[PDB]
Symmetry: C2
Amino acid sequence: SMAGKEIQTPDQAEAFVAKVFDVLDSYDYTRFGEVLSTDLKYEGGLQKTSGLDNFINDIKASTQRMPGLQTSHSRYRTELTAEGTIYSEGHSNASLESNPGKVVTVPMIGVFKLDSEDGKIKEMRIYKDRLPFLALHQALPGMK
Amino acid sequence: EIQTPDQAEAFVAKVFDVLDSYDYTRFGEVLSTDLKYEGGLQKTSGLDNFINDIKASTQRMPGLQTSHSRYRTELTAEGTIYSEGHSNASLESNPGKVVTVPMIGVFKLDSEDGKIKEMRIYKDRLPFLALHQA
């Protein structure tokens, strides 16, 4: 449908990032292709995928690893550079349906590059400390 | 015991952990018996009135889950804590729907025991109208 081709200001850029995470954190895979390029290059720590199908499969597997996983993101400062890069700093939150009172929250930043043809995200690199999430139930069975 | 902004932010984090866990019998560990609270049009004097105000909100919206994050905190020469962050809410009955708004808290401490004697929380409640939406 629509992505980020009309982005020319950092306000428009943060609005797009929020739309993107709304899609991602809903796990509505049928909508991922509205905002993510078919050739998406994603990095999140040591985990790396090339192509939208491989990205979707990795996200689906993460919901198997952790039944009941719920995730959400907020942002407080975003810049759009003259190279077209979007940098967005915020927080990443996660909890499990089986224990909703325990929420792990860490700072995060997303780096995004858009396809010039259609404004979809062609490169997405998310940086955050994933170690605190081992506190979630059965993140690492047997301790960590 | 709070002399630095890092100590102030750690204390605010502890306070919101207690509040967002709805640990009412522990509120007095961090909140003065004479707490003056204001959150928009909600306003209470005294800890027991604060607890009852919060209980009323949870009973009215069953399954409410809340959490807070913060990105900057100041501790002033007068001893005031200002902490800017985000307030998140979701419903146990509506997994996947999270509403997040910017927020700021203003805190003044009792000089005798370090408990919060004034707490003023500012945020827009309008976006939370979307909490029950699929």
